[PDB]
Amino acid sequence: YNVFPRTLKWSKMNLTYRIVNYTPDMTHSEVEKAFKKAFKVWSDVTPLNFTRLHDGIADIMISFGIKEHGDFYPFDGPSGLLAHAFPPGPNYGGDAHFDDDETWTSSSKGYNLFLVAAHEFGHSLGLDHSKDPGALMFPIYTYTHFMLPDDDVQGIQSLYGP
Ligand SMILES: CC#CCNc1ccc(S(=O)(=O)CC2(C(=O)NO)CCN(C(=O)OC(C)(C)C)CC2)cc1
Ligand SMILES: [Ca+2]
Ligand SMILES: [Ca+2]
Ligand SMILES: [Ca+2]
Ligand SMILES: [Zn+2]
Ligand SMILES: [Zn+2]
């Protein structure tokens, strides 16, 4: 696994996240479950915890956008870039953005929100890309009870512990 050199981790165990807006292709419930399940992945192997706030500021501000959307790191329309998150830190730190130009699902068609989101929150927590083609933090999307690969388990625990 790989981590950035920075800013490594959050000084607090219980973090907050917020879902600013939603995608057309999934119901509010579907999306909420994906994100909830995406965090559950990292929380199960770490002392971390995530609380969802309805409004105001949250450590991890989640949102769906297309093209230029407020950070000068524009999306490229369908396919190509799927989503990006920023490593731990104040403000934009932690936040995750999903290209609303892609087709988000709970299945295999288009791109599976949960899987991508699971990856993206990895970033939100301090993990960079893993060179292990079996790691959730590998730079290539690949569709797959979800068990978090070993490398990834090694990753966050080296930051936050078991
Ligand atoms: C199992 C599983 C899974 C999900 N994996 C996954 C793979 C690729 C992407 S991506 O298409 O968003 C590629 C990207 C990524 O991995 N985002 O997390 C986007 C952000 N990014 C970026 O802006 O890079 C430059 C500008 C330095 C080229 C690095 C690559 C997203 C999720
Ligand atoms: Ca709905
Ligand atoms: Ca933030
Ligand atoms: Ca794209
Ligand atoms: Zn963005
Ligand atoms: Zn990535």
Phi, psi (rounded to 5 degrees) for 151: -45, -45
Residue 67 token pair: 């093209």
Residue 91 token pair: 């403000």
Which of 71, 76, 81, 103 best tests ligand 1's pocket when mutated (most atoms within 8 Å of CB)? 81
The reply, when asked if residue 97 is annotated as ligand binding, is yes
User: What CA–CA distance (Å, rounded) separates 84 from 73?
Assistant: 9
Domain ranges in the chain?
Answer: 1-162
Method used to determine the 3D structure: X-ray
CA of 117 to the centre of ligand 6 (A): 10
Per-residue DSSP letter, 80: S
Contact 19, 35 (CB under 8 A): yes
Contact 116, 37 (CB under 8 A): no
CA of 109 to the centre of ligand 3 (A): 30
**Domain 1-162, what architecture?**
3-Layer(aba) Sandwich (3.40)
One-letter amino acid of 110: G
The reply, when asked if residue 13 is annotated as ligand binding, is no
Edge-first strand order for the sheet with 14-19 is: 49-53, 14-19, 60-65, 96-99, 83-85
In the block, residue with structure tokens 């989101």: 117
- Helices 150-160 and 113-125: crossing angle in degrees, nearest 10, is 30
Resolution of this model in Å is 2.8
User: What CA–CA distance (Å, rounded) separates 7 from 87?
Assistant: 8
